[PDB]
RNA sequence: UUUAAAAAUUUUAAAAUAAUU
RNA sequence: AUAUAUAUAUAUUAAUAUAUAUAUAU
RNA sequence: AUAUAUAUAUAUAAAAUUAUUUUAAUAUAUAUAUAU
């Protein structure tokens with residue numbers, strides 16, 4: 001038998017990870033008959049072969065492979081070096097080769113200029129000697145056919161796909177498996193009657209993007225002849241822990257209005273890739289739930305779910321939904337009822353944009369729940385780590401509040417430029433009519449005045465504020481539009497974000513804000529008009545990274561020794577220059593065997609000017625604030641491998657638990673240095 | 680009966696000088 | 701005695717900054 | 727923890743349009759002619 005899965009299957013590691021409990025199969029037992037297959041090199045060959053050929057030809061060829069039929073290529077050097085190898089060590093010559101050619105190669109002459117051997121080599125071709133010879137222009141369908149029928153195939157090129165490539169001659173003449181009745185691996189085929197494909201995982205959620213292309217192309221042409229089997233059917237047929245790889249499903253639920261004992265389904269939705277660990281933690285299963293529980297504010301485990309995922313779309317009309325944040329009708333979600341779970345798979349929580357250790361700027365619209373998400377995020381501290389303290393995050397209003405006329409006060413006086421308004425309430429009435437969605441022309445006349453305030457005041461103030469903030473440690477900073485972080489030249493990762501709710505209603509729900517609620521809302525419209533359209537991309541994309549890796553590591557280092565499983569890596573200054581103390585800058589947490597490996601890495605080729613001060617901090621541990629400015633290069637994440645759970649924010653500060661006296665401050669030209677205990 | 684029209688192609692890849700965006 | 705071209709032959713392949721180790725002194 | 731001398735290694739400076747000038751021995755030896 002043979003089964004194909006949407007994932008890169010390997011015979012070494014895929015047994016360790018399993019992949020079958022991954023996709024949701026109950027293979028767990030003394031099964032030892034589901035033998036995997038090596039498709040790493042096959043994916044690499046597919047990528048290399050799409051470079052020259054066409055995707056349709058390559059995929060429609062590779063689909064007709066009999067993966068349970070062992071075979072192999074072996075490439076020949078070109079004709080010249082081939083003949084050189086025929087000559088030297090001549091007792092390997094196939095008998096097809098011409099009698100004259102063999103009789104002339106068996107001679108010990110220099111072969112400098114043999115008048116007849118030159119002709120005999122000119123009229124010699126490789127294709128006649130070795131029978132199955134693929135081509136330099138094979139037009140690959142015969143490649144897969146010849147791999148299907150036979151044991152060895154002879155190529156004169158490297159662009160081949162289907163099996164491994166073996167060398168024919170020694171390296172000089174070139175330039176620079178048992179079955180188990182339940183074989184599995186990627187790349188479905190239709191070679192036999194027993195090839196099956198495991199359904200249950202959507203096509204748009206496949207993460208590899210080459211397996212994804214292969215599946216799309218094969219499933220749009222061979223839909224009616226493929227054998228689909230779900231994870232339950234596969235289960236019935238059968239019957240250095242990596243962090244940042246989490247299992248995700250999505251929840252199927254509908255809205256219910258249980259008034260006076262009469263159930264009434266109202267709407268059906270899909271939560272779109274909440275991670276499985278959070279559903280396990282919160283104890284979510286098939287039952288009814290109330291998602292407010294008091295005073296019309298969400299119960300906040302529901303808020304955590306909605307903020308840890310992508311967004312929910314209606315199942316009737318396949319479009320996004322954006323559930324209502326208020327508690328006023330027409331639409332109010334007060335009671336839901338989860339009904340099932342569909343496609344499960346792993347994803348890489350580490351975004352590709354994040355490779356170096358640097359600050360993070362998360363742009364959100366105005367009316368989002370930034371305050372409540374901060375209140376909910378500052379509490380988590382898994383292994384005594386405090387993954388996101390409240391002091392490491394920069395509020396969105398801070399850069400505008402630090403001005404003599406603050407920014408919002410500066411824009412409140414904008415009604416003087418209009419032809420005639422005479423008051424802020426008349427401005428809010430002249431802009432949007434008797435609901436939101438203001439008049440676009442009037443909003444444009446207002447934006448032409450709002451813009452110079454944002455380009456001439458806010459940008460110059462922010463260009464200094466973000467520098468001052470970057471000096472004193474990594475911080476997670478928010479904003480109301482990417483243009484704020486782009487005009488003011490912001491350093492760090494620029495993550496746009498978005499929330500699954502209607503943010504414009506929060507601007508009416510919240511009361512005690514400067515100016516009327518209508519003014520806050522018009523201000524949000526102006527920021528949204530100053531936005532430079534680009535994909536906001538689902539706020540949960542960040543919170544999933546923030547939370548998920550720690551929960552997994554808590555299973556591995558839940559009970560080990562804190563001294564043996566810990567570390568900290570900061571800027572070092574020698575015991576002199578007191579006219580040793582290091583600023584932390586990072587706090588690693590990982591098993592002992594990886595701390596041993598991190599203990600020996602360089603960590604010293606990274607420099608920065610640390611400027612210690614003499615100011616005291618109200619916090620308990622007696623410590624003095626400091627600063628630091630990296631010079632040359634930034635710490636890449638590869639050093640802190642995928643097996644440790646580090647922190648993303650940190651303040652710069654030094655503790656002084658010896659001879660308490662703060663003298664004069666200074667700059668010292670620190671050097672990075674690993675700092676753990678004995679372990 | 681002897682003479683003659685002859686091809687005006689490119690975008691010419693790099694290295695130095697000068698002018699410009 | 702010098703050089704140029706003619707035929708052949710032969711060999712042949714073409715500023716600043718930083719890091720590391722040695723030594724001497726503190 | 728540092729200073730000086732030494733040795734080794736590394737990083738840094740672009741694209742386009744226009745016009746002009748230069749890019750088939752490397753060397754020697756024998757036989758031929760010529761010039762100084």
Ligand SMILES: [Mg+2]
Pocket residue numbers: 700
């Ligand atoms: Mg210019």
